[PDB]
Structure 1
């Protein structure tokens, strides 16, 4: 073993305790039921004030809207993550930066989409995810030139390493934005897995399963969603991350797959995914495959907290709070639209 016990708390013990304290504030099942029993978004805020959220929504306008609640939840999560990052040292700082790359990959896609369609880059920043903010000024005032934007990404963005998967700036106008996003995410996931493996010890043990499931679900859902599209099998197989547990002959079989039945057959070889596929009836009124994968992801993130001396706790907390914010937004949507019947579709945590 790497004996992370002896030296982990030297630099990251305070943040380990702090992030666990933050995780203690994630809504439990009872809080979710209490919020489910609300009648109006005002009552939702009332019932939410008794939780860790407190008065995060008191300032906002009385006529609450789901967009306002979502924005406030995202702002709170961003503030907490930024506070944790500012107090983190070199290794944990790199880990948290890797966490933010996931949103930087979507933000850069937004930037290139706007630039190619000739919309001011400065006007796209408001729609970018705060956790992946491009505070660098090299990618601003680009004058709507895709080549300049690509050079800015390569020079003054941590995505330069992931943009070497592409070959040139022409690809920005050549490949579809979805293919670019998925290639960038594949490269980012592989880099993250390599980083976590290099960290080793409890970090690798508690973090490699989560990235492995991420890769496997990416493969499954890219296969399932691309059946009816022009995305060819050869180009589809390029989007499968190689970190997953499907890498030997699993990803290949998925690439050869031509129907959901074949994807289910491929998943059958792995009992942990066999159960997820079995439970995903996908017919109206029952959990879909994406919901089952969300449940498994939440389970893995929760199990990431049984280890102590590792950085996987921060990634697990970020993902768990992301799911909690999505659950609260879903409850608010069900309240606003009066669709109480599906109000139980939220994925509980703890």
Structure 2
């Protein structure tokens, strides 16, 4: 079915983004990167891979903060040059990728207004993959209630606010409860959208989004125990998509200590392995590190089917991991803490 028509609109971009997947640091590239001893050597290694010339015409006193900004500049330009060429089905799907970054921008805007800060102070700090198309909210910047109305007009996120949040809630909620209730609605809507693009998109994409929902339920649960969050607040923040939805979420809402979270994970052999693969001892990979490795295993495996949108989400989450990896290696090299340099996550 979908193979016949998919290359009519997306087949160029499917080829372009697979071209950009060949443009990643291999395990051998990371094993070359960690050998060297200064940020100038990172420049010489990245000069030899597909990142060539990215750091030419820049300040000779390099900093790890420049490496982070330049890797974001590479990632955003590669994404914009796809979104500008994508037609409506994919273009809506790519906008669902951008919506994750938009949530982390709009929460800064609201936080700024709740602390009387002008939005123009936060514009340079917003993720460029979550950048706004309409600027009337940015230009007005007057009050939290004015911004709420201006978000509903200007921002694609408007529906997620209307499902979960009034302006009065934004005066009373913690900003991290706000971010998570938006991400709940975002995942549930984006998972529904991916199942409306049924077949090879859902069959490669839903395994990732179901893992994002399951990972959130685990990590939100184990982190909530040291906090004022009630059983009901955990239940309200969990995404309903993942394998845990029938009962795992209920048992995690009942949980209050890490042993009960492992007892949920013990029912699913994947999650049993993630917990049993990390004690979080000194020099160990932490529980969240095992989840970041599995998120990458899923996003690699989404490239195994030539006719679907799974590659664009997977490409972005793997380029994000590649930016996380190159920055971490650059930190170990610049700070001389080479002991943990092997804690990057391999990709392909």
Q: C-alpha distance in 2, partners of 1:232/1:141? A: 38
Q: C-alpha distance in 2, partners of 1:6/1:82? A: 27
What are the superposed Cα offsets for residues 182-228 of structure 1, whole Å, 9 maximum, x if unpaired? 00000000011000000001001010000000000000000011101
2:286 equivalent to 1:288 = yes
Q: What TM-score, normalized to structure 1?
A: 0.98
Do 1:222 and 1:236's aligned partners in 2 also have CA atoms closer than 8 Å?
A: yes
What are the superposed Cα offsets for residues 25-68 of structure 1, whole Å, 9 maximum, x if unpaired? 11000000111011000111111110010010112111110000
User: What displacement does 1:167 show?
Assistant: 4.0
Task: Looking at secondary structure, tell me which structure has more helix per residue.
Answer: 2
Aligned length: 348
Which residue is 1:338 aligned to?
336
- Could you tell which deviates more after superposition, 88-97 or 55-64? 55-64
Which residue is 1:214 aligned to?
212
Which residue is 1:73 aligned to?
71
Which residue is 1:134 aligned to?
132
Which residue is 2:268 aligned to?
270
Do 1:213 and 1:244's aligned partners in 2 also have CA atoms closer than 8 Å?
A: yes
- Could you tell which deviates more after superposition, 108-117 or 56-65? 56-65
User: What displacement does 1:233 show?
Assistant: 1.1
Residue 52 of structure 2: SS of its match in structure 1? Answer: coil
Q: What TM-score, normalized to structure 2?
A: 0.99
What are the superposed Cα offsets for residues 220-262 of structure 1, whole Å, 9 maximum, x if unpaired? 0000111010011101111100000000111000000010000
Do 1:210 and 1:301's aligned partners in 2 also have CA atoms closer than 8 Å?
A: yes
Residue 164 of structure 2: SS of its match in structure 1? Answer: coil
What are the superposed Cα offsets for residues 68-119 of structure 1, whole Å, 9 maximum, x if unpaired? 0000000110000000000000000000000000000000000000011011
Structure 1: gaps spanning 5 or more residues: none
Q: C-alpha distance in 2, partners of 1:26/1:166? A: 39
Do 1:116 and 1:144's aligned partners in 2 also have CA atoms closer than 8 Å?
A: no
User: What displacement does 1:173 show?
Assistant: 1.1
Q: C-alpha distance in 1, partners of 2:83/2:28? A: 31
Do 1:38 and 1:44's aligned partners in 2 also have CA atoms closer than 8 Å?
A: yes
Q: C-alpha distance in 1, partners of 2:320/2:75? A: 8
